[PDB]
C-alpha cells in the first residue's frame, strides 16, 4: 500500500507539477481519504538518539 501510494503520488506529481494533495490521491486510489492519511502517517523510520 505504501509503495503503490508512493508510485501514484509520483505519477500525479509528474503529471500536474506539484505535490498532490491527499484528496486527489484518494480519488486516484479509489480509497477513502482517512485511509490515505493513516497510510501517510503510519511509521517513518525512528530517528537516532545520536543525531547532532
Amino acid at each position: 500500500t505504501i509503495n503503490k501510494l508512493n508510485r501514484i503520488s509520483r505519477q500525479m506529481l509528474q503529471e500536474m507539477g506539484r505535490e498532490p494533495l491527499p484528496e486527489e490521491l484518494a480519488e486516484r486510489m479509489q480509497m477513502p481519504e482517512d485511509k490515505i492519511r493513516k497510510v501517510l502517517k503510519i511509521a517513518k523510520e525512528p530517528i537516532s538518539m545520536e543525531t547532532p
Partner: protein, 1328 residues
C-alpha cells in the same frame, strides 16, 4: 548632494580624494546565483552546464537515448512574504524539455526511428531574494562562501622534520574537482614513489609502464645521454662545452688540466675527447643492446657497464655506447634507482600491481585492471580536472595546450614527474599552501550546481537501467526520470548544509557581514581539530582581499574571514583587488583588478603617498610593496597605487573611527561586537563616524529606497505612494509607485523589525533616495547605538574592572530600551484517545484566567499578559487513571470528579510580560474553522480588498492624470465633461464614426480594467482561503506573537566600537553623578584604568571629537532659539564646514533658505563628523573644533561630586561616546532550578534554560571539592542532587519536614555502567 544627504551633511575630515566608490556589498551572492540560474548559451555555468554534463543518457545496448533541449523556471506559487508566513520554501519549478529518441535495430546504428518531445518537472529550485537571502521552510538563511584548495597540482616538502637527519623530502599531489587523488613522493633513499588515493606506496614506475613506456623510453625522457665512440682505436667523447666547466684530457693542441679556466680553452672548440676505460666502469647503460648472432641481450638498459661487458660489446662489433647523465648537484639518478626497485617488467604486470594495491584480496583479471586504470584518471565520468583546475595545472607545468581537456594523459603525468624531479634537483620552488592564488572561493551557485549534478546522476543511473530493458513503445520522457532525488539533493543543500546558516539579523551590519563571510570549514574544507597554525595566520596575499581584523575570537580564529571592502571574485573564483594605474609617473583614474599572482610582480604604492597637482608623487622615494615585502622604491619604478584607505579592512572594521590608534586585538573585538547590537526604540546617528554608514544602510535592504524619482503623493506609517516624473515614466504605465513598510515584525533573533517613514507629502524624491528607515537606521545612516555623555574616572568601585555606571536619566529617557518579539505556538494534534480541541472550557481554571480569551479559546489582540497567563486553551482526552484509595475516599466525601480531559494549554513563560500583537490560526484542509479563524480570514480578505481598491484608486488617478495631460496637448474645458455624470459617460450616444470608434475603444478598455481587477482579487482570495499543509496528525496550529519592552538594568552588556565592553553595575540617581559648572551631569562613567593597558586610544579621540561635535550642535541650537538672522546661520555653517584642510567642499550659498533651516534643525543634537580609517582627523583638527565650540583644548573639564558638591582634584575627560546594547541580556541569562525534569536513561537533570535544566558539576569542580576536603558536599552533588532516584525524593521530603539530612544510595549512572559492561560479555559485580 542627494535629497537624503542634503538633509544632514556629515563633515568629512578625510584628505585623500576617493577615486572609486565602494562596490555593492552583496555582489558576492547575487552574481553567483545569477550565474547559476541565468541561461548560458555557451554552457559553462549553472543548470545548463550540469544538464550537458549528465545528458545525453545512452542506453547500454544502444536502443534509444534521452536528450536535453532547454530548461525554464516557472512562476512561484507564493512570493517572499507569504512564504515566510506559511512556512514554505520560496522557490520556482524546474521544467526541462527532453527528447526520447528511439533508434532502429534493423537499420544501421545512428538511425532516428522515432522522436518524442516532452516537458518534464525536475524538482523545485529555491530562489535568492533581492537582498541575497533564501527563504527555506519559512526562515531566512544565508549560504556562506567556502575557501578551499584550487584543483590541480601542488608541490610541497616536509621541511626536514620527519627523518632523523634533515633530508627535506619532496612530494607532489594532484587533486581534481571530482575524482581520485595522485601523489608522488621522495623517500630518504632518494627513490620516487606513487600513491593512489592515499594507500600503500608503489615504485612509481608502474604508471609510465601502464601508458606503455619501455624502460629505454623512460630513461630517454628522464635523463640526458652522453655518448662514446671507438674512433681510430681510441675512446671518443662527444663533448658538450657546458659539462666540463681527475684525469688527463685529450686534444693535445689544447690540453686542459690533467688530474688537477675551462672557457678559455673551450673558446676554440673541438669535438674530440679521449677518456680512460675506468670512466666507463661507474656509468649505467642507457639502451638495450642485442646481438643477432648470439640472440641474447649483452647489456640491459639501466645496468652498470663492466669490463667484461666492454669486452663483450667489443667482440660484438658495437662501437657507440650511450649512457645516462648523473651528478650529485644538478642531475640525479633518482628515476634509475626507482627503476631498479621496480619488480614490474611489462604493462600487464603494471596493471596487475595497480589492481592489487587498489583492491586487495580480489582475483586480478586483465580486463578488470584495464577498466580500473581507465576509470581512475582517463574517464570523463569519474575524473574532472575542471576549467580552473585545468588552467592551474597547465600554469604549474608550463603547458600551453588542451585548455578544454578534463582528464589527464601521458603528457600531464610526465610533466608532473619532470617538475618534481626538477625541484629535487634545485631548480624550481615548492608552492605556498596559504597563498590566495592557491586557494579558491566557492559560492552558492557552485555548490547548488554541484548538488544538482549529484541528483542528476542519481536520476541518470535509474534512467539508464530502464532504457536498457527495451520495451519503450508507450514510454514518455516524463515517465523515465525521478524528480524526488533531485528535490532531496537541493533541499539537503539548502536545509542541512553547514554553510546554509540561520540568518544573523540583529542589525543591518550583521546581515551584511554574514552575507560577506568566507568559511574554510564545511564539506570539502578544513576541520577544526585538523587545522594548524599556518592556515590561521594573515598571509601577505590577504592585503585587500581578506580582512586581517575581522575573525571570530575562539576555536574558529583564522578559519572564518570577512571579504574586504573592495574585494571581488574573478571568473575563476580567485579574489582580486582594484588598483590605480601609474603611467608616465602620474597616478591616473583608470583602475585594474589584480589577483594574488599578478600582484607580486609590480610595485604598488599606498594611498598615503603624497601627490602633486600634476598627478605624480612628491617624494623621490615612496613607500611601496613588492613580492609581499614593504620598502622604499624610486618614484619611476612604481606601477600601481591603492584605490582607498579602507581597502585592507572589512566593513565592520571600516565603521570603527580612529582605528589606526587601536591595537588589532581590540579592533577585532569591536568589529565582532558591532554585530551584536540590538536596535532601540529611537535610532540615533553616530556623532563620530567614518562615512561608510550610508552604504551599509542602503545596501542592507532594511531601508525603503526609491526605484524611481518623483514627488511623495501619500505618506503614512505603513505606506508611501510616489508620483513618478514625466521624463522617466515607461510608455503606457500607471505612473505611480507603492511602498508597503514592514511594521513590528519579528526577526530571527527575536528582535523588532520596524520601518518608519522619513519623508513628507509633496517632498521631491529622486532615484536612490531613502524613503523609510529600517531598524538601526537614521535618515539613511546606520545607527547601531546611542550618543552618551561620558566621564573617564573611577567612581567608588562601581566601574571596577570593566563595570559601567549608568545614570537613572538614561533609563528614564528610554535610550537603550528594546522591543523583543517572541513566537508561541499551540498545536492541536490527533491522538489515540481522541482529537485535541481548542476551547475555552478549561477544567480547574476559573473565570479570572478566562478574561482575556474569546469564545474560541484564543487571547484577544492587545491583551497585556504576564507569566502563567493562558494564551490559547487546549484540552486533551486522557485515559483511565488509578485513583489511590485515600483519594477515592476524598471523592466519596466531596463528590466532585471532572477528569475526562487534561489541560494542556499554551501559557506565557515565567518572567515574560508583554502585549499580544498578532495571532494566526492555521487549520488543516477538512477541519472545521472556529469563530476566531473565521474572523482572521474575514479581516485578511477585507484588508486585501481594501489594499487592492486603494491601489486601483491611486493608479487610476495617475493614469487619468496622464490622459488629461494628453488631452491638454490641445487644451479644452473639462467643465463640460464634468457636466455629464461619470458613469453616464458610458451612456453617451455618438453617430459620427470618428467619435463612435473612440467610444467603443473606451468601453473595451473599461471592460478590460474590470476584468483584470476581478482576476487579481480572485487570485488573492484563492491564496487566502486555501487550507494549510499541516504535518501528519496535526489538526490545528495557533501562533501568538508577544512584544516585550526591555529596559536597561544591571547585568546587561554595553560596548563601544573600540573593543571596550562592560556590564552595568549600578543605575545611579542623577543627583549622585558628577556634574560640570553648568549643572549638566554626565550619563555614564567609565574606568580610565581599562584604556592604557589595552592600547585602544581611538576611544579617547572619539570622546574629544564628540565633545566638540555636541558643542557645535549646542551653538546651532542657541542660534536657532534666539531667532538669529539667516545670514549668520549660513556664516556659522560655512565656518564649521570649512574647518581643516579636508577634501569636502560644502557651499551653503547653493542651499535654499528652507534647505538651510532643515540642515540646521537636523544639526541641533550635534554635528555628525566623518573620520575615515587611516585618513582621519588629526589632533590639531580636533582641538580647532573644540575651540570653535568654546570648549577646553584638552577636552577635560572640572567636575563636582553630586554627593558632596566638592570639585574633584584633577580635570576629567568628558565627552560623547557611541554606545551599543549587545544581545547578552541578563533577562535571557538568569536561570535557577530547585527540582525539575530528568533524563530518560541517566535519570539526571537536563541541561539548558529551555529545559529548566541544572548547572553542570564537572570534573574540575569535583577536584576543587576534593582539594577542600568537603566530602559531604561532594556526596550531595553526586547522589541526592543528580541521579539517586529514591534519595532525591527523600531529600525533598526531609527539607519540607525541616530535617536537613540525607540517605545516600547508588547513582543510577553506575547501574547503567554495570549493565553495559555486562552487555559487553564481562562479569562485573559487587562483593560484600
Amino acid at each position: 548632494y542627494s535629497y537624503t544627504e542634503k538633509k544632514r551633511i556629515r563633515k568629512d575630515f578625510g584628505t585623500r580624494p576617493q577615486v572609486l566608490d565602494i562596490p555593492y556589498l552583496l555582489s558576492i551572492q547575487l552574481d553567483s546565483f545569477e550565474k547559476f540560474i541565468e541561461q548560458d548559451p555557451e554552457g559553462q555555468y549553472g543548470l545548463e552546464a550540469a544538464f550537458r554534463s549528465v545528458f545525453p543518457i545512452q542506453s547500454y545496448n544502444g536502443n534509444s537515448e534521452l536528450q536535453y533541449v532547454s530548461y525554464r523556471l516557472g512562476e512561484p506559487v507564493f512570493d517572499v512574504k507569504e512564504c515566510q508566513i506559511r512556512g514554505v520554501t520560496y522557490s520556482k519549478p524546474l521544467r526541462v524539455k527532453l527528447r526520447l529518441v528511439i533508434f532502429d535495430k534493423d537499420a544501421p546504428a545512428g538511425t532516428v526511428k522515432d522522436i518524442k518531445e516532452q516537458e518534464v518537472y525536475m524538482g523545485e529550485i529555491p530562489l535568492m531574494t533581492e537582498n541575497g537571502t533564501f527563504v527555506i521552510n519559512g526562515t531566512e538563511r544565508v549560504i556562506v562562501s567556502q575557501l578551499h584548495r584550487s584543483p590541480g597540482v601542488f608541490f610541497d616538502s616536509d621541511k626536514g622534520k620527519t627523518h632523523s637527519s634533515g633530508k627535506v623530502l619532496y612530494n607532489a599531489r594532484i587533486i581534481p574537482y571530482r575524482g581520485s587523488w595522485l601523489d608522488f613522493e621522495f623517500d630518504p633513499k632518494d627513490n620516487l614513489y606513487v600513491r593512489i588515493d592515499r594507500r600503500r606506496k608503489l615504485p612509481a614506475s608502474i604508471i609510465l609502464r601502464v601508458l606503455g613506456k619501455t624502460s629505454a623510453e623512460i630513461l630517454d625522457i628522464f635523463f640526458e645521454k652522453v655518448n662514446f665512440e671507438v674512433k681510430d682505436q681510441t675512446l671518443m667523447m662527444e663533448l658538450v662545452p657546458e659539462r666540463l666547466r681527475t684525469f688527463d684530457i685529450e686534444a693535445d693542441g689544447k690540453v686542459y688540466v690533467e688530474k688537477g679556466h675551462i672557457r678559455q680553452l673551450e673558446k676554440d672548440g673541438v669535438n674530440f675527447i679521449e677518456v680512460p676505460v675506468e670512466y666507463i666502469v661507474g656509468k649505467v647503460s642507457a639502451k638495450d643492446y642485442v646481438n643477432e648472432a648470439t640472440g641474447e641481450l649483452i647489456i640491459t638498459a639501466n645496468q652498470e657497464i663492466s669490463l667484461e661487458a666492454l669486452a663483450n660489446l667489443s667482440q660484438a662489433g658495437y662501437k657507440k655506447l650511450e649512457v645516462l647523465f648523473t651528478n650529485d648537484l644538478d642531475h640525479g639518478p633518482f628515476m634509475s634507482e626507482t627503476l631498479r626497485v621496480d619488480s614490474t617488467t611489462d604493462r600487464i604486470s603494471a596493471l596487475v600491481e595497480i589492481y592489487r594495491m587498489m583492491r586487495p584480496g580480489e582475483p586480478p583479471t586483465k580486463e578488470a585492471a584495464e577498466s580500473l586504470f581507465e576509470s581512475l584518471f582517463f574517464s570523463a565520468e569519474r575524473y574532472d580536472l575542471s576549467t580552473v583546475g585545468r588552467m592551474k595545472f597547465n600554469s604549474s607545468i608550463g603547458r600551453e595546450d588542451a585548455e578544454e581537456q578534463g582528464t589527464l594523459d601521458e603528457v600531464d603525468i610526465i610533466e608532473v614527474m619532470k617538475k618534481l624531479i626538477s625541484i629535487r634537483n634545485g631548480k624550481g620552488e615548492v608552492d605556498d599552501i596559504d597563498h590566495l592564488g592557491n586557494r579558491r572561493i566557492r559560492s552558492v551557485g557552485e555548490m547548488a550546481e554541484n548538488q544538482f549534478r549529484v541528483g542528476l546522476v542519481r536520476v541518470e543511473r535509474a534512467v539508464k537501467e530502464r532504457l536498457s530493458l527495451g520495451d519503450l513503445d508507450n514510454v514518455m520522457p516524463q515517465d523515465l526520470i525521478n524528480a524526488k532525488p533531485i528535490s532531496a539533493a537541493v533541499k539537503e543543500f539548502f536545509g542541512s548544509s553547514q554553510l546554509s546558516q540561520f540568518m544573523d539579523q540583529n542589525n543591518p551590519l550583521s546581515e551584511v557581514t554574514h552575507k560577506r563571510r568566507i568559511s574554510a570549514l564545511g564539506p570539502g574544507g578544513l576541520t577544526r581539530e585538523r587545522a594548524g597554525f599556518e592556515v590561521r595566520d594573515v598571509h601577505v596575499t590577504h592585503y585587500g582581499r581578506l580582512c586581517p581584523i575581522e575573525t571570530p575570537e575562539g576555536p574558529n580564529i583564522g578559519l572564518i574571514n570577512s571579504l574586504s571592502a573592495f574585494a571581488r571574485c574573478n571568473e575563476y573564483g580567485f579574489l582580486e583587488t582594484p588598483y590605480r594605474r601609474v603611467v608616465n609617473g602620474v597616478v591616473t583614474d583608470e583602475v585594474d583588478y589584480l589577483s594574488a599572482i599578478e600582484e607580486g610582480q609590480f610595485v604598488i604604492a599606498q594611498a598615503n603617498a603624497k601627490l602633486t597637482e600634476e598627478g605624480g608623487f612628491a617624494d623621490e622615494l615612496v613607500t611601496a610593496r613588492q613580492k609581499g615585502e614593504s620598502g622604499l622604491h624610486p618614484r619611476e619604478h612604481v606601477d600601481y597605487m591603492d584605490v582607498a584607505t579602507n581597502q585592507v579592512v572589512s566593513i565592520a572594521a571600516s565603521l570603527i573611527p580612529f582605528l589606526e590608534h587601536d591595537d588589532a586585538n581590540r579592533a577585532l573585538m569591536g568589529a565582532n561586537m558591532q554585530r551584536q547590537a540590538v536596535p532601540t526604540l529611537r535610532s540615533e546617528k553616530p556623532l563620530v563616524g567614518t562615512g561608510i554608514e550610508r552604504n551599509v544602510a542602503v545596501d542592507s535592504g532594511v531601508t525603503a529606497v526609491a526605484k524611481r524619482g518623483g514627488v511623495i503623493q501619500s505618506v503614512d506609517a505603513s505606506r508611501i505612494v510616489v508620483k513618478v516624473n514625466e521624463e522617466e515614466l515607461i510608455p503606457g504605465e500607471a505612473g505611480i509607485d507603492i511602498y508597503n513598510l514592514t511594521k513590528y515584525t519579528r526577526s530571527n533573533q527575536n528582535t523588532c523589525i520596524n520601518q518608519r517613514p522619513c519623508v513628507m507629502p509633496g517632498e521631491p524624491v529622486a532615484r536612490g533616495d531613502v524613503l523609510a528607515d529600517g531598524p538601526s537606521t537614521d535618515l539613511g545612516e546606520l545607527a547601531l547605538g546611542q550618543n552618551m555623555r561620558i566621564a573617564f574616572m573611577p567612581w567608588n568601585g562601581y566601574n571596577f574592572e570593566d563595570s559601567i555606571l549608568v545614570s537613572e536619566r538614561v533609563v528614564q529617557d528610554d535610550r537603550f530600551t528594546t522591543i523583543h518579539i517572541q513566537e508561541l505556538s499551540c498545536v492541536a494534534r490527533d491522538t489515540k484517545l481522541g482529537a485535541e480541541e481548542i476551547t475555552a472550557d478549561i477544567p480547574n481554571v476559573g473565570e479570572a484566567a478566562l478574561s482575556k480569551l474569546d469564545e474560541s479559546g484564543i487571547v484577544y489582540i492587545g491583551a497585556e499578559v504576564k507569566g502563567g497567563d493562558i494564551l490559547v486553551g487546549k484540552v486533551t482526552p486522557k485515559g483511565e487513571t488509578q485513583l489511590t484509595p485515600e483519594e477515592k475516599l476524598l471523592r466519596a466525601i466531596f463528590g466532585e470528579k471532572a477528569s475526562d480531559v487534561k489541560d494542556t494549554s499554551l501559557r506565557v513563560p515565567n518572567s515574560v510580560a508583554g502585549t499580544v500583537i498578532d495571532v494566526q490560526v492555521f487549520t488543516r484542509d477538512g477541519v472545521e474553522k472556529d469563530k476566531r479563524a473565521l474572523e482572521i480570514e474575514q479581516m485578511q480578505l477585507k484588508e486585501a480588498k481594501k489594499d487592492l481598491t486603494e491601489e486601483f484608486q491611486i493608479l487610476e488617478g495617475g493614469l487619468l492624470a496622464r490622459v488629461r495631460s494628453v488631452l491638454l496637448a490641445g487644451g479644452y474645458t473639462e467643465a463640460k465633461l464634468s457636466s455629464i455624470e461619470r458613469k453616464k459617460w458610458l451612456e453617451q450616444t455618438l453617430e459620427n464614426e470618428e467619435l463612435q470608434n473612440q467610444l467603443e475603444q473606451l468601453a473595451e478598455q473599461y471592460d478590460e480594467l474590470k476584468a483584470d481587477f476581478d482576476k487579481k482579487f480572485e487570485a488573492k482570495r484563492r491564496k487566502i482561503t486555501q487550507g494549510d499543509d499541516l504535518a501528519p496528525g496535526v489538526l490545528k496550529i495557533v501562533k501568538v506573537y508577544l512584544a516585550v519592552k526591555r529596559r536597561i538594568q544591571p547585568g546587561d552588556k554595553m560596548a563601544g566600537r573600540h573593543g571596550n565592553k562592560g556590564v552595568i553595575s549600578k543605575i545611579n540617581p542623577v543627583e549622585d553623578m558628577p556634574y560640570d559648572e553648568n549643572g549638566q551631569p554626565v550619563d555614564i562613567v567609565l574606568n580610565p584604568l581599562g584604556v592604557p593597558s589595552r592600547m585602544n586610544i581611538g576611544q579617547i579621540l572619539e570622546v574629544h571629537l564628540g565633545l566638540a561635535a555636541k558643542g557645535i550642535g549646542d551653538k546651532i541650537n542657541q542660534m536657532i532659539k534666539e531667532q538669529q538672522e539667516l545670514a549668520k546661520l549660513r556664516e556659522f555653517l560655512q565656518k564649521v564646514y570649512d574647518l581643516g584642510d579636508t577634501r569636502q567642499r560644502v557651499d551653503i550659498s547653493e542651499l535654499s533658505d528652507e534647505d538651510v533651516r532643515t540642515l540646521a534643525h537636523n544639526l541641533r543634537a550635534g554635528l555628525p563628523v566623518a573620520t575615515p580609517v587611516f585618513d582621519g582627523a588629526p589632533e590639531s583638527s580636533i582641538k580647532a573644533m573644540l575651540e570653535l565650540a568654546d570648549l577646553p583644548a584638552s577636552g577635560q573639564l572640572t567636575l563636582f561630586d553630586g554627593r558632596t558638591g566638592d570639585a574633584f582634584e584633577r580635570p576629567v575627560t568628558v565627552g560623547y561616546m557611541y554606545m551599543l546594547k549587545l544581545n547578552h541580556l541578563v533577562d535571557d541569562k538568569m536561570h535557577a532550578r530547585s527540582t525539575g525534569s530528568y533524563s530518560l536513561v541517566t535519570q539526571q537533570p537536563l541541561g539548558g534554560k529551555a529545559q529548566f535544566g541544572g548547572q553542570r558539576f564537572g570534573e574540575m569542580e569535583v577536584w576543587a571539592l576534593e582539594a577542600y576536603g568537603a566530602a559531604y558536599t561532594l556526596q550531595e552533588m553526586l547522589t541526592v542532587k543528580s541521579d539517586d532516584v529514591n534519595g532525591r525524593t527523600k531529600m525533598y521530603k526531609n527539607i519540607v519536614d525541616g530535617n536537613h539530612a540525607m540517605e545516600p544510595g547508588m547513582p543510577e549512572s553506575f547501574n547503567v555502567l554495570l549493565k553495559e559492561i555486562r552487555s559487553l560479555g564481562i562479569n562485573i559485580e559487587l562483593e560484600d
